[PDB]
Design an enzyme around this catalytic site. Structure first.
Site, mmCIF file in Angstrom:
data_model
loop_
_atom_site.group_PDB
_atom_site.id
_atom_site.type_symbol
_atom_site.label_atom_id
_atom_site.label_comp_id
_atom_site.label_asym_id
_atom_site.label_seq_id
_atom_site.Cartn_x
_atom_site.Cartn_y
_atom_site.Cartn_z
ATOM 1 N N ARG A 123 -2.864 -9.473 6.529
ATOM 2 C CA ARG A 123 -3.403 -9.645 5.182
ATOM 3 C C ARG A 123 -2.340 -9.164 4.200
ATOM 4 O O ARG A 123 -2.152 -7.958 4.019
ATOM 5 C CB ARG A 123 -4.714 -8.883 5.013
ATOM 6 C CG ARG A 123 -5.409 -9.128 3.685
ATOM 7 C CD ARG A 123 -6.704 -8.339 3.577
ATOM 8 N NE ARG A 123 -7.321 -8.494 2.263
ATOM 9 C CZ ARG A 123 -7.013 -7.755 1.202
ATOM 10 N NH1 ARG A 123 -6.093 -6.805 1.298
ATOM 11 N NH2 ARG A 123 -7.624 -7.966 0.043
ATOM 12 N N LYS A 162 0.787 -1.187 0.000
ATOM 13 C CA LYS A 162 0.000 0.000 0.000
ATOM 14 C C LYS A 162 0.823 1.243 0.000
ATOM 15 O O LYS A 162 1.974 1.194 0.191
ATOM 16 C CB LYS A 162 -0.942 -0.011 1.150
ATOM 17 C CG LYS A 162 -2.168 -0.769 0.889
ATOM 18 C CD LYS A 162 -3.015 -0.806 2.100
ATOM 19 C CE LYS A 162 -4.092 -1.767 1.849
ATOM 20 N NZ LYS A 162 -5.021 -1.894 2.957
HETATM 21 C C1 LIG Z 1 -2.934 3.209 -7.106
HETATM 22 C C2 LIG Z 1 -2.338 2.816 -5.773
HETATM 23 N N1 LIG Z 1 -1.020 2.842 -5.439
HETATM 24 O O1 LIG Z 1 -0.926 2.408 -4.149
HETATM 25 C C3 LIG Z 1 -2.122 2.118 -3.647
HETATM 26 N N2 LIG Z 1 -2.355 1.633 -2.331
HETATM 27 S S1 LIG Z 1 -3.467 2.285 -1.311
HETATM 28 O O2 LIG Z 1 -3.948 3.560 -1.768
HETATM 29 O O3 LIG Z 1 -2.880 2.643 -0.051
HETATM 30 C C4 LIG Z 1 -4.771 1.103 -1.104
HETATM 31 C C5 LIG Z 1 -5.974 1.463 -0.516
HETATM 32 C C6 LIG Z 1 -6.974 0.513 -0.369
HETATM 33 C C7 LIG Z 1 -6.769 -0.786 -0.814
HETATM 34 N N3 LIG Z 1 -7.792 -1.760 -0.664
HETATM 35 C C8 LIG Z 1 -7.454 -3.141 -0.741
HETATM 36 C C9 LIG Z 1 -8.007 -3.869 0.468
HETATM 37 C C10 LIG Z 1 -8.998 -4.837 0.303
HETATM 38 N N4 LIG Z 1 -9.484 -5.476 1.384
HETATM 39 C C11 LIG Z 1 -9.007 -5.174 2.642
HETATM 40 N N5 LIG Z 1 -9.544 -5.875 3.806
HETATM 41 C C12 LIG Z 1 -9.053 -5.569 5.127
HETATM 42 N N6 LIG Z 1 -9.575 -6.251 6.256
HETATM 43 N N7 LIG Z 1 -8.043 -4.580 5.299
HETATM 44 C C13 LIG Z 1 -7.527 -3.906 4.184
HETATM 45 O O4 LIG Z 1 -6.666 -3.064 4.332
HETATM 46 C C14 LIG Z 1 -8.039 -4.227 2.802
HETATM 47 N N8 LIG Z 1 -7.539 -3.570 1.696
HETATM 48 C C15 LIG Z 1 -5.568 -1.142 -1.402
HETATM 49 C C16 LIG Z 1 -4.569 -0.194 -1.547
HETATM 50 C C17 LIG Z 1 -3.051 2.356 -4.649
HETATM 51 C C18 LIG Z 1 -4.552 2.174 -4.587
#
Ligand SMILES: Cc1noc(NS(=O)(=O)c2ccc(NCc3cnc4nc(N)[nH]c(=O)c4n3)cc2)c1C
Length: 256
Positions: free
Chosen positions: A232, A196
C-alpha cells in the site's frame, strides 16, 4: 503471481498526500501500475475525531460510484460494516479494515456475504502484555479465523502488520525484522509503510513525505523478498515499476 500494487486514494486532505478530479487521479494511478485502488476517508489514529457513518458515505460513495466501472480492483478503507456493505453493493472487491473486525464484528459476515476480500490490519492503543510480534500474530490469526468462520477462504484474507499503529519505532523495527514470521501464516500479507514515520528513521534525518518515496520502495523490494503479496503505497509508479523488477528477479531465480 505478481505482487499487487495498492494505490492510496485519500478522500480527505492528509499530511502525507472533487469527484471529477478524483477520477483523473484514479486513471493516472492505474497507468502507473496500480492493481488495487484503496479509497479511504477515516483514520483510526488517536490524533483524530471519529466522524459519523453518514458523513463517511458522503465521502467515499461519490468517488467509488464513479470508479466501480473501471478495470481495476477497488478497496475501501473502512471499519464500519454499514460503509462496507454500501460499497459492496456497488461492486467493490476488497474491504480494508483497520480494526480487523474488532470495532464491528459484523464486517466478517458482510464481506463473506459478497464473496469479497478483507484486509486485517494490526491496531490498538499501544498496550500489550507480550512482545509486539507475538501480540500481533496472536491478534491477527484470531481475526483471520473469524473471517474463515464467516465463510471467507484463506486466499482472500489479507494480513497487515499495521505499521504506525500501537507501535513505537523500536517495535516497528522489531516487526520489520521478522516479516517472515508473518508470511509463514500462509495468508497473503499486505505491507503499508508509505511515507510513514518508520521511513523517517531509515533516512535518519527530518524529511518531507514526498521525499520518502525512495525509502518506501526499499521496503517494497525488501518485503517482496520476504514473501509479501501486496504493498500500500502513495507513489504508485516508483513502487509498481520497482516491484516488477523484484518479481522478475525472484521468478527468474525460482525458474532457474
Ligand atoms: C504527522 C505524521 N508524520 O508522519 C506520520 N506517519 S505515521 O505516524 O507513521 C502514520 C500512522 C498511521 C497512518 N495511517 C494511514 C493508513 C491508512 N490505512 C491503512 N491501511 C492498511 N491496511 N495499512 C496501513 O498501514 C494504513 N495506514 C499513516 C501514517 C504522521 C501521521
Amino acid at each position: 503471481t505478481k505482487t499487487k500494487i495498492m494505490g492510496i486514494l485519500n478522500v480527505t486532505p492528509d499530511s502525507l498526500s472533487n469527484v471529477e478530479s478524483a477520477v483523473t487521479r484514479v486513471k493516472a494511478m492505474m497507468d502507473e501500475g496500480a492493481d488495487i485502488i484503496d479509497v479511504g476517508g477515516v483514520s483510526t489514529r488517536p490524533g483524530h475525531e471519529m466522524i459519523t457513518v453518514e458523513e463517511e458515505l458522503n465521502r467515499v460513495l461519490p468517488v467509488v460510484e464513479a470508479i466501480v466501472g473501471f478495470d481495476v480492483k477497488i478497496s475501501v478503507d473502512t471499519f464500519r460494516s454499514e460503509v462496507a456493505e454500501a460499497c459492496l453493493k456497488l461492486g467493490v472487491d476488497i474491504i480494508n479494515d483497520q480494526w480487523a473486525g474488532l470495532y464491528d464484528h459484523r464486517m466478517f459476515q458482510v464481506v463473506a456475504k459478497y464473496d469479497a476480500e478483507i484486509v486485517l490490519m494490526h491496531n490498538g492503543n499501544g498496550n500489550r502484555d507480550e512482545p509486539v510480534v507475538e501480540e500481533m500474530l496472536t491478534s491477527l490469526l484470531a481475526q483471520a479465523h473469524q473471517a474463515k468462520i464467516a465463510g471467507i477462504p484463506s486466499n482472500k484474507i489479507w494480513l497487515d502488520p499495521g505499521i504506525g499503529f500501537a507501535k513505537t519505532r523500536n517495535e516497528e523495527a522489531e516487526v520489520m525484522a521478522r516479516l517472515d514470521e508473518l508470511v509463514a501464516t500462509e495468508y497473503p500479507v499486505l505491507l503499508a509503510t508509505s511515507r510513514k514515520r518508520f521511513t523517517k528513521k531509515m533516512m535518519g534525518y527530518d524529511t518531507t513525505p514526498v521525499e520518502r518515496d525512495e525509502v518506501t520502495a526499499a521496503t517494497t523490494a525488501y518485503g517482496i523478498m520476504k514473501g509479501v503479496r501486496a504493498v500500500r503505497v502513495h507513489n504508485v509508479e516508483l513502487n509498481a515499476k520497482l516491484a516488477k523488477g523484484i518479481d522478475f528477479l525472484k521468478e527468474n531465480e525460482n525458474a532457474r
